[PDB]
Design a protein around this ligand. Structure first.
Ligand code: CU1
Ligand code: CU1
Ligand code: NA
Length: 382
């Protein structure tokens, strides 16, 4: 790899709930600045928003690969779907994003004229916030509605700049979008589009509000009831025995956001990553994995075939815990694997759900987290 996925820096910090995250002046300002920074980078820059999101689906090109690397076994996206590697591949996927996103936030923290240390420390603690869809499906206005958002300027004064969280603006629309009727002319990413291809946020807020109750119940059953890895990892082939998987419950959020009258970006695996809200989603999807690990310790990746097909594995290939997770590398010559990814500390992150039980026995944690899930996703509306 040209850019190994080593994760963020500054020790093990928590990925905050977006509801709390937006209330944090330093974190929110750094996120809005850094996110705009990587969105404005050249799309041929590997550490740019485009190439980072491009890893998931289109374009079908290698990411941060050496000059004389062997041809990829399959021309398609990188993301692993309908297979046993879904949870682990996406865990390290958010890691490279969070890593690159912090790196931009460091340069941002140097532009501040006052409190240079505190801005430097905030960047060090900066992590990808998660969207708790199971407890609060309707996100904050900063994420879904506010065209302009309040941040702190480099002099300390409060200003309002355009919100980079709502949508990404292609520059240009990559030549690999040509064949697809609606996404080739769409200048920016779109959520819940109408028949006239116009974005419809109001209808989206309405959709989420109604799907809220069912989403909490789906999330509850997913977290608590999954002994074997096969039924928990993937959904394929959208059957009943996988309906309670981490991915199946994960699919509903892509549909809610992307699927309107016509299909938007979030409801298409080849374009879903380009929507900025994609990362808040899969940060929470990763939190589910962390919570599930607390309930089902010892259970991890089991063997399974590549059914859909990705640029890492051709259809029919056998996959296990020792399978390489392209294009994510521990070092220059060592690809990531599922085995070590049980410990998020290796990527310098964690979730606030575990704060009151740090350094506790697996038994105490399993009881604390279980009560946590029951109390949060096992009760009535919020
Ligand atoms: Cu994916
Ligand atoms: Cu997804
Ligand atoms: Na790609």
């Amino acid at each position: 790899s040209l850019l190994a996925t080593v994760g963020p820096t500054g020790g093990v910090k928590n990925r905050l709930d977006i509801v709390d995250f937006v209330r944090d002046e330093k974190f929110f300002t750094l996120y809005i600045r850094a996110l705009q920074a990587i969105q404005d980078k050249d799309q041929s820059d590997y550490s740019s928003f485009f190439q980072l999101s491009g890893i998931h689906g289109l374009p079908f090109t290698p990411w941060a690969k050496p000059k004389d690397t062997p041809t990829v076994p399959y021309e398609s996206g990188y993301c692993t779907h309908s297979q046993v590697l879904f949870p682990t591949w996406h865990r390290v996927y958010v890691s490279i994003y969070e890593q690159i996103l912090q790196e931009a936030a460091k340069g941002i923290a140097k532009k501040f004229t006052v409190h240079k240390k505190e801005w430097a420390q905030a960047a060090e603690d900066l992590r990808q916030p998660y969207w708790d869809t199971g407890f609060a499906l309707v996100p904050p206005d900063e994420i879904i509605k506010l065209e302009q958002v309040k941040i702190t300027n480099y002099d300390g004064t409060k200003i309002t700049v355009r919100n980079p969280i709502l949508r990404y603006s292609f520059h240009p629309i990559d030549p690999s979008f040509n064949g697809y009727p609606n996404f080739d002319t769409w200048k920016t990413t779109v959520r819940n589009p109408d028949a006239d291809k116009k974005e419809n946020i109001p209808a989206l807020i309405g959709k989420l509000d109604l799907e809220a109750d069912s989403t909490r119940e789906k999330t509850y059953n997913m977290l608590k009831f999954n002994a074997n890895w096969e039924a928990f990892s993937n959904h394929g082939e959208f059957d009943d025995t996988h309906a309670n998987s981490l991915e199946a419950v994960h699919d509903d959020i892509h549909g809610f956001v992307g699927r309107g009258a016509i299909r938007g970006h979030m409801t298409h695996a080849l374009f879903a990553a380009f929507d900025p809200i994609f990362w808040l989603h899969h940060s929470n999807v990763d939190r589910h994995l962390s919570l599930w690990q607390a309930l089902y310790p010892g259970v991890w990746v089991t063997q399974g075939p590549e059914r859909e097909g990705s640029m890492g594995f051709a259809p029919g290939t056998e996959l296990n815990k020792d399978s390489a997770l392209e294009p994510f590398y521990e070092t220059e010559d060592k690809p990531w694997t599922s085995v070590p990814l049980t410990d998020t500390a290796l990527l310098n992150y964690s979730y606030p759900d575990f704060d009151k039980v740090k350094g506790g026995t697996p038994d105490l944690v399993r009881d604390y987290i279980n009560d946590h899930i029951d109390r949060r996703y096992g009760i009535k509306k919020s």
